């Protein structure tokens, strides 16, 4: 039995590992740079969480775990090193944690779609009553602790291909959503090391599911999914307000109809990768499809934060920060909400943006999280109705609440709090 100190315990990754250790009866506590929903959540469980970082937050741990972001001048790390307490890195510790688990492993990695795909896998395994241990890089309400759940079945987790060390894992099954290799910083900016990393994890995995259209990684798959090419393919897709349907072909033959409560074309691809994995493992797909149909999504991946049915008003949260992610988000907003007014409140993240937001009816841009006016400027140039609001607390206030309108609060940062405040405003308003 050990006492573990988590430096950066407020992150989605770290809180999962902390919760797991907490679930295993270890003395757990940690610290974080800022307060987060995880720090709030973990405190409610009775875990001491100290914000901000200070060597004051030392309680003679047997072990200290840190995220790649924790710098060597972090006072906690300095104390730990001087106190000679062993310090470990999140991923590396996680791998060791799996080694201890000695369980069947379902890993999902990739540039995009990774967290939702992982949530889908976890959701299927839970539906099939396989009671999996889940480590999610996002929040799924069906999970006992949101981004984590302890079970005695297999373990499902997300592997971040940002850290080259992901290639050191060797799960039973691995879904690789895609691999654009847009963050080679940890691969000495070498697409070759990046490729090698995938090559390597593929070699040590029993079954690899891969995106037939992913230039970099398609050949590694034992089975593939794609739209027009691959083992599992899409013959037809129809998106509607309450759900979207897709006719799936297997090696070219109509094989099944996929129904998802969750919208967006990309979620079909994520569901396809899931189907591919489970079908490949010989699972009766009837319950797998029932589960996929019921999958409720991960917070901030086009999640409905609030809906007023009397007024036909929606507040939706989405992590998008890239022009393409925004073009996609809006395309799915239009598929789901054919006639409603679409209002995007976008907080850019630490040119093409204006063209991506063109599909919205109203755009409010804020300052970047950690220039925003340049986007406003661009929007203004494409000649459409946009606003710039620089102070984050003003965001919810600036908005005109109108019926038949979907308010999409878009961004990877702070914006998530405006969204909640906007909902609270609305509610108190009623």
**Residue set of the binding site for ATP:** 110-116
Q: What is the DSSP string of 286-315?
A: HHHHHHHHH----TTSSEEEEEETTTTEEE
For 155, the enclosing helix (H) or strand (E) is strand 155-159
Peptide bond into 283 cis (omega under 30): no
Residue 324: strand, helix, or coil: helix
Cα(18)–Cα(117) distance, integer angstroms? 22
Chain breaks in the chain (C to N over 2.5 A) after: 350, 370
Q: Which residues pair with 174 in a beta bridge?
A: 107, 208
Do β-strands 63-66 and 232-239 pair in parallel, antiparallel, or remain unpaired? unpaired
Handedness of CA 227, 228, 232, 238 (dihedral sign): positive
Cα(304)–Cα(297) distance, integer angstroms? 10
Q: How far is CA 13 from CA 21, 48, 86, 194, 223, in A?
A: 13, 17, 20, 22, 28
The residues, any chain, with a CB within 8 Å of residue 401's CB and separated by 6 or more, are 313, 426, 429
Residue 272: strand, helix, or coil: helix
Closest CA to 86 of 60, 62, 110, 70: 62
Residue 351: strand, helix, or coil: coil
Q: Which residues are annotated as a binding site?
A: 110-116
> Residue 184 is encoded by which pair of tokens?
């080679």
């Amino acid at each position: 039995h050990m006492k573990i100190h988590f430096v950066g315990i407020g992150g989605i990754g770290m809180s999962a590992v902390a919760l797991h250790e907490f679930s295993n009866g270890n003395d757990v506590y940690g610290s974080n740079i800022e307060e987060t929903e995880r720090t709030a959540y973990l405190r409610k469980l009775g875990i001491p969480i100290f914000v901000p970082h200070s060597a004051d937050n030392w309680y003679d741990p047997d072990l200290v775990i840190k995220t790649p972001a924790v710098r060597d001048d972090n006072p906690e790390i300095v104390r730990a090193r001087m106190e000679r307490v062993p310090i470990e890195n999140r991923l590396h510790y996680f791998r060791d944690t799996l080694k201890r688990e000695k369980k069947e492993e379902f890993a999902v990695t990739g540039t995009d779609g990774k967290t939702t795909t992982t949530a889908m896998v976890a959701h299927v395994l839970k539906h099939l009553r396989k009671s999996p241990t889940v480590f999610l890089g996002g929040i799924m309400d069906s999970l006992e602790h949101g981004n984590y759940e302890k079970g005695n079945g297999p373990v499902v987790y997300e592997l971040d291909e940002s850290e080259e060390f992901f290639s050191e894992f060797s799960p039973n099954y691995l879904i690789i959503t895609n691999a654009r290799g847009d963050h080679l910083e940890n691969y000495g900016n070498s697409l070759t090391r990046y490729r090698s990393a995938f090559e390597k994890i593929s070699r040590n995995t029993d079954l690899v599911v891969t995106f037939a259209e992913d230039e970099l990684t398609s050949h590694l798959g034992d089975v593939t999914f794609g739209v027009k090419k691959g083992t599992y393919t899409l013959e037809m897709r129809s998106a509607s307000r309450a759900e979207q349907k897709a006719m799936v072909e297997k090696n070219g033959k109509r094989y099944l109809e996929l129904k998802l409560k969750v919208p967006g074309f990309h979620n079909v691809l994520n569901a396809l990768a899931v189907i591919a994995l489970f079908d490949s493992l010989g699972y009766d797909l009837a319950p797998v499809l029932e589960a996929l149909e019921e999958f409720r999504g991960v917070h901030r991946r086009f999640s409905i934060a609030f809906h007023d049915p009397e007024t036909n008003i929606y507040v939706i949260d989405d992590y998008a920060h890239t022009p393409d992610e925004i073009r996609n988000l809006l395309q799915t907003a239009k598929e789901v909400f054919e006639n409603e007014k679409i209002v995007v409140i976008f907080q850019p993240h630490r040119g093409n943006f204006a063209k991506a937001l063109q599909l919205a009816d109203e755009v409010v841009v804020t300052e970047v999280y950690d220039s925003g006016k340049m986007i406003w400027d661009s929007l203004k140039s494409l000649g459409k109705e946009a606003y710039f609001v620089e102070k984050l607390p003003e965001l919810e206030k600036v908005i005109s609440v109108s019926e038949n309108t979907v308010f999409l609060f878009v961004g990877a940062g702070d914006i998530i709090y405006s969204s909640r405040r906007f909902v609270e405003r609305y509610q108190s308003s009623k």
